Design a protein around this nucleic acid. Structure first.
Ligand SMILES: Nc1nc2c(ncn2[C@@H]2O[C@H](COP(=O)(O)OP(=O)(O)CP(=O)(O)O)[C@@H](O)[C@H]2O)c(=O)[nH]1
Ligand code: MET
Ligand SMILES: [Mg+2]
Ligand SMILES: [Zn+2]
Lengths: 117, 267, 470, 77
RNA sequence: AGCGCCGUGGCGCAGUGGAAGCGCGCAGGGCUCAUAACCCUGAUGUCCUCGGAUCGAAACCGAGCGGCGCUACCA
């Protein structure tokens, strides 16, 4: 009843290369397609590179020369570490704060680990 | 209005240790201004320049910054200082930098006072810095003793009482210190009670806290109790925390428990 | 436009709240199923057994909702040493129309005495059939003494088996054997994994499990498919707990005692010590009723060594300041439940692992600490907990004199030296203090493959007393 | 964690189960390249290698101590 | 949950008190027949968001954020 198919709700990233400006207008769409806080998505995506662009609206803006496969790999690794729990196949899992750090919690079950780095 | 060398006379002395700020280097070396004595320019020749062999004059000078130095001769007829940097003992370089720091702090305070009062800084130093440096060896110790003792200003003639008030305020907000003394006591009690015992030791240790210097002993762990105090003079805390140790030992040795000391009182 | 918290508060007040325990009720009439006992304290201890990397804390959390910590940074992920606790309330629907399987509903500790049913279409409420305590026990090959202690505390069993791995896993067999050692037969077998499996793989695994339990002590043990992640089929487990497992004989006649398995210190850091709390010994009461403000002594207590190498035991007398049970501070305690006795025992004595398996007796009793004990031992044939790669699961050899062997007398975890070897009896010399009150159930483990490995069971017959030093 | 990487050349990130001077002795011969064991002010381990031989030091830790071979990242540079 | 640290110029390190720091990078130029080596010049920042004393704060202080590290799950 619950799973007629037996997760794959991860859209192909769309990055626009305007010569000198790389725009990713898919950050909020993947925020709603992964059930994450967009502020945390943006803070991680800044913390992985040497860049901290601009937030506009539902989109991240950076000014340089960059590819599109890089953030596909970034998204897949991020899914393996946060978006999908290692223990179970679920996306709806997300980050709460039970101390001072971020505690990773699930929504199908409620698994409680400390995944914040 | 920035003038009025820190020390007594306009003329720097011989063989003295100084800290020089660089402005200009053409061919003979660096004739530079001085920020330890008066701003009379002291000239440095290439021979006295580099401890190593000079490889590129651009790198080793770094114009616009201070470097340790010594003065060989002083022209006491119109002003021509002969100055060097390589002939300084490596042990006294940090001390030269410390003297530069002390002078710079004092002059920042007194420059604030002058720019606030529009009083010539020479007037302020001749009424403030010189008498204090005589009375206490240095103006920095004079200001520090002004923080604790208000009698350091007695026997001195200010140009205006407003100078005294504003200067004391800026010292009390800018020279506010007081080193934390911290220690850790272990409770090894396997005993019958031991929460009322720690409560009683807490009462008899926290009551000891004087007005100027309080001993508040926080909790971080059941065995490890921390001992934190603000030692204004850095020598009361040793005996206060030794008293805390003797109090906790007297509390424990009769009720049944045992405790030792992990970290003794250290600055 | 009510906030969710406001709606929960309204449902809590509507459900009668949680009536406070009487200060001085008639005990000769109190039963473990009485309303006053059942509302704020658990009466039966249920422990879970399973193999590593399967998930027992997850199932306990799904059943109740009380989290099991899993502390100590390194142990946050791999394995826990201290036991896990969780309070669940058995609530059954009073309405006959709704189906029996989903009538039962297990709730968490601070729920009201009667919550509203969550099934759509039933205006009925729930009634509290029983309050159950959960003692999660480690299932790793290194940590056995804690598991044996908690199984001694344990009164009801939940065995967890997952299907997709090898059918004859050894850890569950070892835990079942340990439970069979200490007079416990109410075992409920639970299938961890059913979702990712095919309809015939599950049947084959069930046939394997049935084949497994045919010659062991437990015979009529039910098997129930459950889920730890999807959180389904929990009401059926609740029904099986209600039906299969009765109340072990536990009345108020027998003398009071305490068996502390965990030591908890209450020292909130950062707060000034002016307002502190006493130290807490987490102990199970299997026999007796404990009340607020009682005098109690830890029997083995202060172990010290004199300059001559002699072992001195100083019993730790203390007054009970509080008896924390379930969720709220209570006035009286019920045997058959893990309760935190918060006394004036020095907090450093309850720091990490000091009161792990210690007997404690209320003032008005004289337990006996022993140095040399007489034990009756019975062995098994094949060592359980080992995967032999196709050759004769190891045969247990006979014991030899002067070998340090782990003799888990109930909760006490000690390494005893054998002084005498015969067909059934053995003299155990104890360097660590151990005590005997009536019989005590005991487990025996040897060191044959590095870590401790169970061999058989043991019962104390006699002992050499050590007179307390007052 | 335990992140190991090579930056144009130097290897930063070195588990110390084996001696670092022994690391120099097992690098210098086979690689024939200059290597400097420099202690930076409190970063990870620094070992030099003249000439770009990143795949060669890949082969090297394959030979001596490499046991994971997945967190070692070949930098572009 | 507290206490001991941090807040980058791609990075490491510094003084924080009169106002962008040094070096490692990057680019460009000089050297040389040429390369390397060497030498010169640059452009990369709310040195983390918000306030206070102060002619002035990146710092001196905090009313908190984000990450570290010690206690240790801190009923
Ligand atoms: N797919 C699946 N995963 C499960 C199930 N139950 C638990 N898990 C997984 O197990 C993990 C939790 O394991 P945990 O309960 O800590 O194991 P453990 O009880 O400590 C093993 P031990 O008792 O030997 O110490 C979760 O991350 C979860 O994904 C299940 O029914 N299905
Ligand atoms: C002593 S462990 C059982 C739960 C405990 N009384 C709470 O807190
Ligand atoms: Mg556990
Ligand atoms: Zn999950």
């Amino acid at each position: 009843t619950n799973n007629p198919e037996l997760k794959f709700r991860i859209p192909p990233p769309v990055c626009l290369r305007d010569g000198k400006k790389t725009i990713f207008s898919n950050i909020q769409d993947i925020a709603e397609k992964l059930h994450r806080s967009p502020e945390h998505l943006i803070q991680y995506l800044f913390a992985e590179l040497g860049t901290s662009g601009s937030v506009d609206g539902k989109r991240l803006v950076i000014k340089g020369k960059f590819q599109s496969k890089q953030m596909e790999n970034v998204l897949r690794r991020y899914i393996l570490e946060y978006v999908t729990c290692k223990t179970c196949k679920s996306i709806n899992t997300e980050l709460k704060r039970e101390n001072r750090l971020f505690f990773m919690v699930c929504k199908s079950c409620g698994s409680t680990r400390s995944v914040s780095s | 209005t920035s003038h009025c060398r820190f020390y007594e006379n306009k003329y720097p002395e011989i063989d003295d240790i100084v800290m020089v700020n660089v402005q200009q280097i053409a061919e003979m070396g660096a004739y530079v201004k001085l920020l330890e004595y008066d701003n009379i320019e002291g000239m440095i020749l290439l021979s006295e320049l580099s401890r190593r062999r000079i490889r590129s004059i651009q790198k080793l000078i770094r114009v616009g910054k201070n470097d340790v130095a010594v003065v060989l001769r002083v022209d006491k007829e119109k002003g021509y200082i002969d100055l060097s940097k390589r002939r300084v003992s490596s042990e006294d370089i940090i001390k030269c930098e410390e003297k530069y720091q002390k002078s710079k702090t004092v002059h920042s305070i007194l420059r604030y006072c002058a720019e606030k009062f529009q009083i010539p800084l020479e007037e302020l130093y001749k009424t403030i810095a010189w008498p204090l440096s005589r009375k206490f060896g240095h103006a920095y110790e004079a200001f520090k003793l002004s923080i604790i003792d208000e009698t350091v200003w007695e026997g001195i003639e200010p140009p205006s009482k407003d100078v005294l008030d504003e200067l004391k305020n800026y010292i009390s907000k800018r020279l506010t210190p007081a080193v934390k003394i911290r220690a850790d006591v272990e409770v090894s009690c396997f005993s019958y009670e031991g929460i009322d015992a720690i409560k009683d030791a807490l009462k008899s240790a926290e009551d000891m806290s004087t007005e100027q210097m309080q001993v508040k002993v926080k909790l971080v762990a059941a065995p490890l109790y921390v001992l934190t105090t603000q030692a204004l003079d850095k020598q009361k805390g040793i005996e206060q925390l030794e008293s805390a140790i003797e109090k906790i030992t007297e509390v424990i040795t009769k009720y049944g428990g045992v405790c030792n000391i992990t970290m003794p009182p250290k600055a | 436009g009510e906030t969710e918290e406001e709606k929960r508060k309204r449902e809590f007040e509507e459900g009668g709240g949680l009536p406070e325990q009487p200060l001085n009720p008639d005990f000769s009439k109190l039963n473990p199923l009485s309303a006053e006992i059942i509302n704020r304290q658990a009466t039966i201890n249920i422990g879970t057994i399973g193999h590593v990397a399967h998930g027992k804390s997850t199932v306990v959390r799904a059943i109740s909702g009380v989290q099991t910590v899993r502390f100590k940074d390194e142990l946050e992920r791999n394995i826990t040493i201290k036991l896990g606790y969780a309070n669940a309330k058995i609530y059954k629907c009073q309405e006959p129309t709704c189906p029996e399987p989903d009538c039962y509903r297990s709730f968490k500790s601070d729920k009201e005495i009667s919550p509203k049913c969550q099934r759509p279409g039933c205006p009925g409420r729930y009634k509290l059939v029983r309050h159950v305590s959960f003692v999660d026990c480690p299932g790793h090959d290194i940590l056995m003494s804690t598991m044996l202690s908690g199984a001694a505390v344990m009164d009801a069993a939940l065995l967890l088996i997952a299907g997709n791995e090898s059918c004859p896993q050894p850890q569950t067999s070892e835990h079942l054997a340990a439970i069979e050692i200490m007079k416990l037969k109410h075992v409920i077998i639970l299938q961890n994994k059913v979702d990712l499996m095919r309809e015939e793989s599950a049947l084959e695994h069930q046939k394997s499990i049935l084949k497994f339990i045919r010659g062991t002590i437990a015979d009529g043990a039910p098997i129930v498919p459950i889920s730890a992640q999807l959180k389904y089929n929990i009401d059926a487990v609740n029904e099986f707990i209600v039906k299969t497992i009765p109340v072990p004989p536990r009345d108020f006649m027998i003398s009071p005692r305490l068996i502390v398995i965990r030591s908890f210190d209450v020292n909130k850091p950062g707060a000034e010590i002016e307002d502190l709390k006493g130290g807490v010994a987490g102990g199970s009461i299997l026999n007796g009723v404990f009340k607020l403000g009682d005098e109690i002594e830890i029997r083995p207590g202060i172990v010290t060594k004199d300059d001559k190498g002699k072992i001195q035991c100083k019993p730790i007398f203390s007054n009970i300041v509080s008896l924390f049970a379930e969720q709220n501070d209570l006035k009286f305690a019920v045997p058959g439940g893990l309760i935190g006795v918060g006394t004036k025992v020095d907090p450093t004595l309850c720091r990490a692992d000091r009161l792990v398996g210690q007997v404690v007796g209320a003032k008005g009793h004289l337990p006996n600490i022993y140095t040399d004990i007489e034990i009756n031992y019975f062995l098994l044939r094949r060592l359980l907990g080992v995967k032999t790669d196709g050759q004769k699961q190891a045969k247990v050899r006979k014991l030899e004199p002067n070998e340090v062997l782990m003799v888990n007398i109930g909760s006490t975890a000690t390494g005893a030296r054998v002084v005498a070897v015969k067909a059934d009896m053995a003299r155990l010399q104890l360097t660590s203090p151990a005590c005997t009150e009536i019989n005590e159930k005991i487990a025996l483990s040897r060191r044959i493959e590095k870590h401790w490995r169970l061999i058989g069971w043991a019962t104390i017959k006699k002992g050499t007393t050590l007179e307390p030093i007052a | 964690s335990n992140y190991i990487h090579i930056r144009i050349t130097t290897v930063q990130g070195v588990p110390e189960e084996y001696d670092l001077k022994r690391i120099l002795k097992v690098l210098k011969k086979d690689f024939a390249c200059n290597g400097n064991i420099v202690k930076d002010p409190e970063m990870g381990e620094i070992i030099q290698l003249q000439g770009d031989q990143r795949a060669k030091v890949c082969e090297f830790m394959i030979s001596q101590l490499g046991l994971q071979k997945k967190n070692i990242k070949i930098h572009g540079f």
